[PDB]
């Protein structure tokens, strides 16, 4: 019971951190692509 509290306690924390990393990765993509899209699309529009 003690041993595997420790195993669950840890597992639940890495869960938490992984959720932070997954969220930070989604936000990193959509944020970067939205800014790329703005800069890129103004080039395309002017090119056109």
């Amino acid at each position: 019971q003690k041993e595997n509290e420790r195993l669950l306690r840890d597992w639940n924390d890495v869960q938490g951190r992984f959720e932070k990393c997954v969220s930070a990765k989604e936000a990193l993509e959509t944020d970067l692509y939205k800014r790329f899209i703005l800069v890129l699309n103004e080039k395309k529009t002017k090119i056109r």
């Binding site: 990393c21 939205k34 800069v39 080039k43």
Partner: protein
Amino acid sequence: SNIFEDVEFCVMSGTQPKPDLENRIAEFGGYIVQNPGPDTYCVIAGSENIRVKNIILSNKHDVVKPAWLLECFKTKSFVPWQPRFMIHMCPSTKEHFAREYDCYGDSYFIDTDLNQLKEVFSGIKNSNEQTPEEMASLIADLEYRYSWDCSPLSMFRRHTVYLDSYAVINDLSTKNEGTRLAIKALELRFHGAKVVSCLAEGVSHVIIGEDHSRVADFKAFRRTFKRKFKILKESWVTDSIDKCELQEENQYLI
């Protein structure tokens, strides 16, 4: 150096030795002006002084990074100005940049690099008006055009995924949480999948864990559908991630 002659400066700050800034300018012969009148070219300052705040409050001058002129001294050739080389610009240069730049700060007439693109990006405002679904297809199309689509963190981009974390299919809190299925939704999201909480027509995949209690009902509900989802074991997504590459489904069916 017989270049900076006929070009008139203003070293308003600099303390990099400030009194040596104009000295270095002097063996280059740059015309040294203590206080910038309407004639002068630009103003150079190693920091902000209150006079700098003034000339900011009156746009009638062009206000420059300290490093730029050092680079022009290390090009042994005047380097005409670029977005990073400034920290503020005059209205004549702003109307010139209304021809010569994208409105966010990416100059049309110069090719940009990592630190400059980071800067432009950090200066764009924060917004989320694009639907997650619009955005996913913008991204899916850009990675298709430029062949980024096999990139590992995007391998499930073209997968819409229902996940069997629901004791009742589609009922949003029959949620069987604390499941190792919760790690598989972190994983699918981390590698570009559209993880969904309803089994509508839009789904390409259902993912099944240990509990096969609902597979008869996924298989039955899938008799309804026009385009028909696969039902896959958890191990598909694992193995695809571990090999950095889509392993493909049919060994992982049901």
